[PDB]
Amino acid sequence: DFLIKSKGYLDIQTGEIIKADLLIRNGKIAEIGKINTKDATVISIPDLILIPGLMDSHVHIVGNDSKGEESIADSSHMGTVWGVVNAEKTLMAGFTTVRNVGAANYADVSVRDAIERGVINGPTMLVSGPALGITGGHCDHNLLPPEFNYSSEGVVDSPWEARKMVRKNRKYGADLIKFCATGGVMSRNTDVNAKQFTLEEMKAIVDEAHNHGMKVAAHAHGLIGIKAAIKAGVDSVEHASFIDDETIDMAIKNNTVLSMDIFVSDYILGEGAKAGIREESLNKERLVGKKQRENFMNAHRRGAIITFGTDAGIFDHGDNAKQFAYMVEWGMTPLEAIQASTIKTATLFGIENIGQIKEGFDADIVGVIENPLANIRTLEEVAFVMKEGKVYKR
Amino acid sequence: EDFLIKSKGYLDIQTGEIIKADLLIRNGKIAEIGKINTKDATVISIPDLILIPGLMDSHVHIVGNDSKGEESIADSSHMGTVWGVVNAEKTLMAGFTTVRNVGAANYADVSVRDAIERGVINGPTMLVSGPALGITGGHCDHNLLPPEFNYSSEGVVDSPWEARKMVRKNRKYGADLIKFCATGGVMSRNTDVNAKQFTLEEMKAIVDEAHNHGMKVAAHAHGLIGIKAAIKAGVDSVEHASFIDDETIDMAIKNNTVLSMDIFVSDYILGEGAKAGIREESLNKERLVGKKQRENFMNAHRRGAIITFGTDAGIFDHGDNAKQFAYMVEWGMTPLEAIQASTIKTATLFGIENIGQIKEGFDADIVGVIENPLANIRTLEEVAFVMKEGKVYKR
Amino acid sequence: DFLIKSKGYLDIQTGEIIKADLLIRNGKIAEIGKINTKDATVISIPDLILIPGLMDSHVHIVGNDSKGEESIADSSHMGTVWGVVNAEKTLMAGFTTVRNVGAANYADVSVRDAIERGVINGPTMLVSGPALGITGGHCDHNLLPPEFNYSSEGVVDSPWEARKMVRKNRKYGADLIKFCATGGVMSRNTDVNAKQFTLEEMKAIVDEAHNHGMKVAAHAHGLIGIKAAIKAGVDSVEHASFIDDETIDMAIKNNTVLSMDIFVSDYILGEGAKAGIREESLNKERLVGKKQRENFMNAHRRGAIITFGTDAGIFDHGDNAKQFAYMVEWGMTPLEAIQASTIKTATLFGIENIGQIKEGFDADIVGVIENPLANIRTLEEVAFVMKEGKVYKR
Amino acid sequence: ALGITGGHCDHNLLPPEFNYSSEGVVDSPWEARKMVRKNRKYGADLIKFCATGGVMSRNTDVNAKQFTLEEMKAIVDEAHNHGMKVAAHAHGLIGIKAAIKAGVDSVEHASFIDDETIDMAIKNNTVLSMDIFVSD
């Protein structure tokens, strides 16, 4: 049992700093206010303001981050090694629950299960397994000559094939299903504006996933794909870069969350240009970047649900909180930006008893130096992290 | 040669009346009822015993490996066949003369069935399903190996035409009926009991093809949404039916959908099975299912739904099937209704005539028992005389 | 414990009937003499003479015995069902240890393990797994058209292929290795007098098997294959139908046991002719039958070790004891015939503590009506069977 | 690790219907040669093989030799050609002899090593890597 004495805590619903102590037992926030101090151990942390543990709705924790010629023939296990490292970095940054949204060989379930079993430290991961795509789509790997005839793990090309891949992902322990509805920036030979998958295929994916109580995320930059994903019944649209007034309203009507990664565009065009990102990808980034944040601002105003998704993996894991500054700059209040990373994500994830400092809820608590409603860039350097009643950072 | 059964009196399963008579048995049928011209050959003098028709179980798994421990880990599938021989005898000796085997691999169930039929081994007449059909990762699938193995079990199908083909394949290799998983289950790893498995289109395809070949369809379904779908697809029986509500009990009544409910086996799983080697995930899913199923069993009987005697023997010991009768009367059936559920009700479900009744022309599947079963139903738990097809197997 | 009081017991070495009691503890014969019936519990069988449990060195317990058109498309599991039936029949006939010498799919290890676990009743089986043969050999199944290109489980065609099949059999639990060194009677398109396998292949089979502590049996009718099998170093030659003076001496020198089935030829030409045995097989039986028993007589005289192998499976399981009468008629004393089925087999099998009613040995004991040295045909109907301290027949 | 079909390095935990053999299973000198080459291809520093049965595996005789000497020599020759060292798992005496005779750089466990073959190891610079603690 822990008793947490602090400068106060953010009531995320109201936007209030409230001065109270927190009693923690069985990894849950047991009690809030003045508590009987005779009992057990005390976390004296009186200068820090406490916020609920942060959430990212779009990460790629597992994957090889080694670069250069020496890493060319690396096995898939190197990506699992990197997953361990990056899971720690994500948690230490104050992110306690994340949505891993594409990985190969179910190494994402392995890292998730290892965290859950307390083998390694990291956030609670909700994992997708291999993302589902058409032949030659964004989800497919178009880097080998046709003599190889290589298609990646999640490539499906009929409603029933798609159905079966959803079933196979669930079999090997996926929490959600992810699919590419358009082309993308980071892949080779994909049109960002063209729709990938027929609506029948998209509907089959969504129907099957929901039947198993799994939520569906859809990668979609181009407008025609965003429309189709919403119409198919997805729970979130990732990126949503060219969303217009009419289909923002479609999303509002259908409770479709818009998981928009407005920060990562600056990394790709700046730091990523000489990091090793291809020339074809940088040109597709120009088409997407500036237009996405304009649409982000419009979508928020019109009233669409937007979550905090960063596409961490492209940029460094642990730097996820840099998106908060971008989020307020493009039309959100500091409170709204933090709500997008807590209560909004919680609903999207379909997990209750997280995202709020409230009695009964899980003890996922982040301590921060300044007031986050005054300066949101304090989230970029957190000073206390507790996940499930365990302290990982001081 | 002919036999004369001098009994304390047989039970007319239609009426409830212990009609005192004698029975002449020739060619494996009941030829004469009443006082007969004692003409021919030998006399089965067994006058302490009340006579009932041979008992039926609509849900068994006779073939399967019952060996436990580390020593049995790399056993071939033939061990499950060996056990099948053992368990077939144990089933017949417990007074069950016709059973419906409802899920087995490699058509070993048709091999055991045929062996019994050929007189190679002793056991009940089996109606066999072959491999049960299920989706990838479903209850019918084996979810115990790593993804690297990419293992899916025999009856895994994932499209209406794949499903169609599997029904045809089972028929090709000698199946009598078709069985499929409509929801997740208790005993499997990584299955949601509440969630539906298969699309309705898939289910309808299975049913349509099976019925086209004169095969009946059983559907494993715990969750309500899958029970609805199975009935709507047109199955002949819903196994378990654990979360069936008022509305869909009426659906079943309207469509002649039998409810094959296993109310006994839950006590074995939570009690004896907890230390026997049943996984922690399975025991938690049993607590969700068990108590609620029997409440729904009581409600379904009262609303007027056809319920058969199905035990899920294989989980518990084969031979102990008759233990469910006590549970059956306790949960709203009369002693007569519980025996009817194991005789006439099952015979219709099985689609076999000339069985389930002590009547002239019917098959000589006759069980002798000590006390009156309408007085004490637990006498069925220890039968003293078993005749199957005019041959005596127990005295 | 068990205290067996009988008329007496056959001393298998001397041929005398010793009067004593037999104390049984933990499956072994603990004491032989006048024994204080002390703790427990007495088996009074005063009319019966006790002999060691009988052995067969050549059986096929697992295999489909169903005939007619209805059995044509039977799965291999029907052979397993029949295996259960035939194991019981073998044990009730007073055979407590047998050597099963060819079966498919490791169904023989399944039946053996089921008996060992006490799931079913039967003798202790020593099993071979699939017999090794060349393409188109006696061990191969030559009943399908060439379009099918079917070769059976144990077909090997190089020394390293043969090595690997031995290793594979051991992996899936075989006790011994069996191979075809010549063509046979019961197969289609095989020359009985032609050698199958090169010597190099034969030597590789034997070397690998011996390296693992497995014994090697070789099916060999034709003289030239018998020679080769002995030269390769086999522990037994099955059938050995055309063995001459020179190679009988080869067998004596090398301790090569001759497992000869003299009875079964009368079944094949008589009962089997109408049972469904093909015309090509009956003609090859006429070449083998009469000549084999003449050679059996010569080999015994010259001093070669001959065990009791019947080829049960062709004829009915349980009728194994009929070979005893044939065995005395062709040059053995009644004692020598029973010795061939007890002490001789035990050595061949490589199992100690069986085959003798002796202190420390296993309680494999058969009770019989008359004296077996007076009338050997009492073995054809035994009255008492105990295997490993358990009574199966009274 | 390289091993025979059904050996200590093989995994004998599945039914014969699966026909599963593990990654390093080799059953001829040239197969063995190839697996050494494959291991080197994907970055191995040394080669390890099972020369006898072991404790922790299912269905293996600890005192029986696994691999022919020819196979063993092929493994060692090929590894040495690439400047890789060879370790050999060996409990039983008859396998330890063979591994030394084949020219391994170390014998792992070496549980039943006698006077004569300790001298063989000394003469050949064969290191004995012995795990005396783990049995407790």
Ligand SMILES: NC(=[NH2+])NCCC[C@H](N)C(=O)O
């Ligand atoms: N707003 C952005 N440009 N985000 C980057 C998109 C990255 C995404 N994985 C793709 O390849 O399409």
Ligand SMILES: NC(=[NH2+])NCCC[C@H](N)C(=O)O
């Ligand atoms: N009353 C019961 N618990 N019935 C369910 C028995 C187990 C069932 N075959 C399953 O795994 O789903």
Ligand SMILES: NC(=[NH2+])NCCC[C@H](N)C(=O)O
């Ligand atoms: N002595 C004999 N009858 N030998 C022939 C027995 C049949 C033997 N299994 C074969 O086909 O060769």
Ligand SMILES: NC(=[NH2+])NCCC[C@H](N)C(=O)O
């Ligand atoms: N006494 C010992 N060192 N025992 C442990 C041996 C471990 C080795 N991996 C084996 O199973 O063979």
Ligand SMILES: [Zn+2]
């Ligand atoms: Zn958590």
Ligand SMILES: [Zn+2]
């Ligand atoms: Zn994307």
Ligand SMILES: [Zn+2]
């Ligand atoms: Zn992404």
Ligand SMILES: [Zn+2]
């Ligand atoms: Zn706002």
Ligand SMILES: [Zn+2]
């Ligand atoms: Zn019948």
Ligand SMILES: [Zn+2]
């Ligand atoms: Zn079920």
Ligand SMILES: [Zn+2]
């Ligand atoms: Zn069942």
Ligand SMILES: [Zn+2]
């Ligand atoms: Zn009633």
Ligand SMILES: [Zn+2]
């Ligand atoms: Zn024995």
Ligand SMILES: [Zn+2]
């Ligand atoms: Zn033969």
Ligand SMILES: [Zn+2]
């Ligand atoms: Zn034979």
Ligand SMILES: [Zn+2]
């Ligand atoms: Zn003699």
